[PDB]
Ligand binder design. Sequence first.
Ligand SMILES: *[C@@H]1O[C@H](CO)[C@@H](O[C@@H]2O[C@H](CO)[C@@H](O[C@@H]3O[C@H](CO)[C@@H](O)[C@H](O)[C@@H]3O)[C@H](O)[C@H]2NC(C)=O)[C@H](O)[C@H]1NC(C)=O
Ligand SMILES: *[C@@H]1O[C@H](CO)[C@@H](O[C@@H]2O[C@H](CO)[C@@H](O[C@@H]3O[C@H](CO)[C@@H](O)[C@H](O)[C@@H]3O)[C@H](O)[C@H]2NC(C)=O)[C@H](O)[C@H]1NC(C)=O
Ligand SMILES: *[C@@H]1O[C@H](CO)[C@@H](O[C@@H]2O[C@H](CO)[C@@H](O)[C@H](O)[C@H]2NC(C)=O)[C@H](O)[C@H]1NC(C)=O
Ligand SMILES: *[C@@H]1O[C@H](CO)[C@@H](O[C@@H]2O[C@H](CO)[C@@H](O)[C@H](O)[C@H]2NC(C)=O)[C@H](O)[C@H]1NC(C)=O
Lengths: 75, 75, 75, 75, 493, 49, 49, 49, 98, 49
Amino acid sequence: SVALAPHVGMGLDTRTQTWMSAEGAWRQVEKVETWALRHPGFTILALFLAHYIGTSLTQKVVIFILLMLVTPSMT
Amino acid sequence: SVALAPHVGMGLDTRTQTWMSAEGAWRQVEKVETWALRHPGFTILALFLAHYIGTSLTQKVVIFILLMLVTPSMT
Amino acid sequence: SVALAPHVGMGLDTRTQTWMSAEGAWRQVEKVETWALRHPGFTILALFLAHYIGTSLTQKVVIFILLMLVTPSMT
Amino acid sequence: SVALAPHVGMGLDTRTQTWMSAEGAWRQVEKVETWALRHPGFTILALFLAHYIGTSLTQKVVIFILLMLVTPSMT
Amino acid sequence: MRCVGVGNRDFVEGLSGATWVDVVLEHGGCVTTMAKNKPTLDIELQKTEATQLATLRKLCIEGKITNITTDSRCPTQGEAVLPEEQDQNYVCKHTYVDRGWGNGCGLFGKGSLVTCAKFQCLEPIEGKVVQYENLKYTVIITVHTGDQHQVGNETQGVTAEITPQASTTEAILPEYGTLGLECSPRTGLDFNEMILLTMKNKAWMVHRQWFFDLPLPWASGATTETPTWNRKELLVTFKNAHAKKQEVVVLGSQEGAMHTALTGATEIQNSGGTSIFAGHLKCRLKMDKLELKGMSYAMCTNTFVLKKEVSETQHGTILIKVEYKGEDAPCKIPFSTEDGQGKAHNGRLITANPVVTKKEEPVNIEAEPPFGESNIVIGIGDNALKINWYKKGSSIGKMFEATARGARRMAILGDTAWDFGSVGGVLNSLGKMVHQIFGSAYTALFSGVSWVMKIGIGVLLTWIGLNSKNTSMSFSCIAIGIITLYLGAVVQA
Amino acid sequence: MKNKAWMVHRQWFFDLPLPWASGATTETPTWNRKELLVTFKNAHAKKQE
Amino acid sequence: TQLATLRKLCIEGKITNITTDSRCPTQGEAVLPEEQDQNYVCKHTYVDR
Amino acid sequence: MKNKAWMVHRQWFFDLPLPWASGATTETPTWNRKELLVTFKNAHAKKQE
Amino acid sequence: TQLATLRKLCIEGKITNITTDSRCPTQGEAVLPEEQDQNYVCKHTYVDRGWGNGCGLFGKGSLVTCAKFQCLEPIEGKVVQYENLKYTVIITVHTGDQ
Amino acid sequence: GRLITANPVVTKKEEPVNIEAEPPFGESNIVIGIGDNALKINWYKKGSS
Ligand SMILES: *[C@@H]1O[C@H](CO)[C@@H](O[C@@H]2O[C@H](CO)[C@@H](O[C@@H]3O[C@H](CO)[C@@H](O)[C@H](O)[C@@H]3O)[C@H](O)[C@H]2NC(C)=O)[C@H](O)[C@H]1NC(C)=O
Ligand SMILES: *[C@@H]1O[C@H](CO)[C@@H](O[C@@H]2O[C@H](CO)[C@@H](O[C@@H]3O[C@H](CO)[C@@H](O)[C@H](O)[C@@H]3O)[C@H](O)[C@H]2NC(C)=O)[C@H](O)[C@H]1NC(C)=O
Ligand SMILES: *[C@@H]1O[C@H](CO)[C@@H](O[C@@H]2O[C@H](CO)[C@@H](O)[C@H](O)[C@H]2NC(C)=O)[C@H](O)[C@H]1NC(C)=O
Ligand SMILES: *[C@@H]1O[C@H](CO)[C@@H](O[C@@H]2O[C@H](CO)[C@@H](O)[C@H](O)[C@H]2NC(C)=O)[C@H](O)[C@H]1NC(C)=O
């Protein structure tokens, strides 16, 4: 494919190993983390957006985590 | 692999268009759209989560849209 | 036996980098962490001690963390 | 660096006398005492910390003695 | 010129009364002295030798054991003594062993036992001391000559050797007059308590009390034929298998445990005569006997050309290397700075007197533009090529970098760093006095606290400071805590 | 690459995950991080290919 | 003009030679002689014997 | 070691901070975690050995 | 008897064949062709380079060093499997005997 | 400070007359003769009042 929609989580799994598990386990996460360490500018805006949206620490945390996670994965 | 993390927003602005502006302008939204059309199940879960966490209207809609964007991209 | 009481904290130095800077700096905490990983039961013991003494919360934290820092180092 | 975390406390032994019994047993406390004798100022610091936190007397003793036991050993 | 881009090089623009400026030049990096109508002097500390060392006490790491002896007594007879116990070369220890008819003793029970061992350590490490009357502080200074072989050169300068015998010395620059160094080596880094700890082929610097508390057997160091070891027992153990008998075993070498035992210690190269580095001394610059190359030259009237491009120096300065093709006589290089859409004069010449020497030497100019976009015109006449450089950053960034540099410099030199620029005296002295008064007690308080523990105690004091209903307690605790965290983030450099 | 060229920001030109080499064109490049390209798959227990 | 080349990457592979080795349980990690060369990549995995 | 033996715990021996080998009685060992036995002094910032 | 070596670990080491390369400050990391050898120890550090070091651009560039490594007097930790134990017990009777 | 000796005088040129003096606690320089070549001795006494 365009390698943007990996064939993952289809549910039709078996005891045997998949094509690539040791790397696909952390591929997307490592992309997000290298993004975040490269560019901290988005973090300030994400913190502000989570903070000034109606704030209960549950809501603030979930909004901040999602907003900091979505932009890197889906640029 | 390297197919992930394009430097779409890298900021080296230019007047002429880029390598693939036409496709890259919409490929991510295309991935999300085809993921949603393939799998309708996540919509119910996102609606449930937003409805039972969103205190207000705007918080609910923001939570719903972020959840519906992150998961297809994180797939 | 001489490895205990390493020459550190004594004021005799300058901006020239000293002996074994990074390794020696992180050595003590790495050893404490690996000893903690070896024996998780003392974590339960220290939690009990911290919970049953202190009569506060910040004090509970102080005794817990410092006590947990003692034993791998007094070992 | 290996001198830290000496093999002690691990349960594998019997009534046969082990390696360096007396010397190894008293080594740690002798080192702590000599470090304390080198730097008496930290005694004043630990007394201040114990006095201004604890809100009791037994707790004051616990933080004072244990804190004084930490630093020569974390050194 | 003697140094560019070293990382700690820092300008000092001081013009005090009688033109003396005090700089405390540390060993890590140089200083640059830009002055008005003076040649910009560049000074870096060179090798700081200290020869003819005195051994003081030496102590051994590896030991060897020979000539085992042993006697025993019946259980109620008391202690046992071997005739060779009084020898200082023998290590003895008393232990209780069960004796009986199988051991040829009529009375059953536990009798005392003792063992002996001749002891001669191998590869003894020796800790020498340096007395003040043999120091070999030397300082090499260079002038910002227009010269192609001067951009970052390390083997061109004038050597000024300043021992504590000759406390103040003057160095004669070849054609720039002379400089007067009024130094004070006696107040530099302490050299009466430090003990050089040369072992194998590597040396070290250690505290006096710490070296006197190393738990290894020592000798006198009287260069005697044979040493007489104190506290031998601590290097050899005596396994007592059950209670039948005991034998002696040495603990091998110790060089690994020794190398681990000193991390915070600074290392020093020792080949023949010791050539220790990393020391710092303060000095006073008598700049009142200087001349500026040739001030009676004429200004150039021909073109210039860039042999090599310009480049920054992570300090906001440029190195422009220019070749003068004009055949005419040696002439002062004209210079002006053209700001963006303006003719204003901003920026100055660090070289301060760029002059061509032989029409074939690409003499190089060093300067700094304003933080905006700049235009550096380099010659007279309409056909004078304009070097354009765009120096990124703003003035406030320079202010923050200066604050960081000043704090880091104070974190090492303590009170001595309080005077590093002009002599001042009206207000600098009082600040130095008060900071010294507080800092002597402070460093006398935390002496011996590690990296993570200093950080932890600082944050604990801060947390205490944010939970008290007292202005005095709150401010004192929070200030001490924040200062402690900052010092811990820089300590053990 | 091939007959085409591009301009990419330098900071982004080391973080894209691929093997890299000194670029000394000495005909025997010892590639750093070879593990990233080649992939091992272990079947259900047993052998490894 | 007058370019300089650094960090040439590699966008293909060709695993030509393959080798393997095993060791019985509780007998340490099985080494392979073709381990210290500047052209071999591999990892250790666990198998049931 | 040398001529004296000792008894130690399994996990403790697997956490001794010294570089290890496999023990496959190979011709030459392949040392894991060598960095922990040798230090790299960086005199100022000029060079390191 | 008949012990199995399992893993061995060394105490004294020796270093030979020093190598080193460096890059201009903005060129990035530096790699030596011998880094992939398991016998070489490598470490990256930042060093300030300039016209005195033969680099056109001033700043801080990366630096790396290598070293062949062959430990001396390696200590080896063997294990004893149960099927080779040699427990022995000597018993005596209270004979009347001198 | 104080010249602890009363008033040193050179009785004869050939062999030195030795002065004794007590400097202040702070780092203080001490001169003897007069002129550019006048011998000057630095000292730093350790302690406070
Ligand atoms: C310590 O132990 C060593 C051995 O472990 C002892 O060395 C032995 O010393 C004796 C007397 O000095 C040597 O005997 C000599 O033999 C020559 C042969 O002709 C004889 O002519 C001499 O009159 C003398 O009896 C013996 O060879 C030597 N053994 C060795 C070196 O292996 C030593 O005496 C013990 N004590 C001390 C204080 O060293
Ligand atoms: C590691 O460093 C050592 C020296 O510290 C290097 O040893 C040197 O190796 C070269 C090539 O193997 C030797 O040159 C040889 O000389 C003979 C003389 O006839 C010549 O016929 C051979 O063709 C070869 O060129 C050199 O003598 C030797 N120097 C010594 C041993 O002191 C070694 O190459 C470095 N690298 C490695 C991987 O060991
Ligand atoms: C530092 O300065 C010295 C002195 O100018 C340079 O040594 C000169 O090198 C040139 C090379 O063309 C020779 O022609 C001169 O004879 C040398 N002069 C001497 C040895 O006194 C040295 O090269 C400079 N450093 C650097 C890195 O260039
Ligand atoms: C690794 O694989 C190569 C792949 O060719 C092998 O080299 C072959 O070895 C056989 C055995 O002697 C020869 O008959 C072939 O002619 C070789 N082919 C080539 C192209 O050289 C070999 O198994 C290994 N090569 C090594 C270890 O150098």
